[PDB]
Amino acid sequence: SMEQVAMELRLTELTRLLRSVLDQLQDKDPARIFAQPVSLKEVPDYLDHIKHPMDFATMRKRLEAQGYKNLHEFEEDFDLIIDNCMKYNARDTVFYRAAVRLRDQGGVVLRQARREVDSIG
Ligand SMILES: CC(=O)NC1CCN(Cc2ccccc2)CC1
């Protein structure tokens, strides 16, 4: 239908907007601590600790299959990345601190992205 096509045009342009947002987000992770899923080879008990793993590679796969229907969903996964890290790793570690910095630098990007999503509808 025309209705379905228009629906998919918005989804596509959402996806274009999210791909940008996701790049700005990785750019704030120069150490690439969150680029890839935590290796179960190197940390074999990880899933005993973290129930829902997330990372940028995984988010990017979902994104390219247009699996993000709105910004709430995308933010949910981004927060998973941060919250998992600040749980699994202790306060005085390089990993925890990298997450706190991503959280803070990221929040700016998501503050404006939320406005662009509303207005562009
Ligand atoms: C995003 C995130 O939580 N990263 C974690 C992955 C595990 N490393 C520690 C590590 C490295 C190598 C071997 C055994 C443990 C850093 C913390």
Ligand code: NA
């Ligand atoms: Na902890």
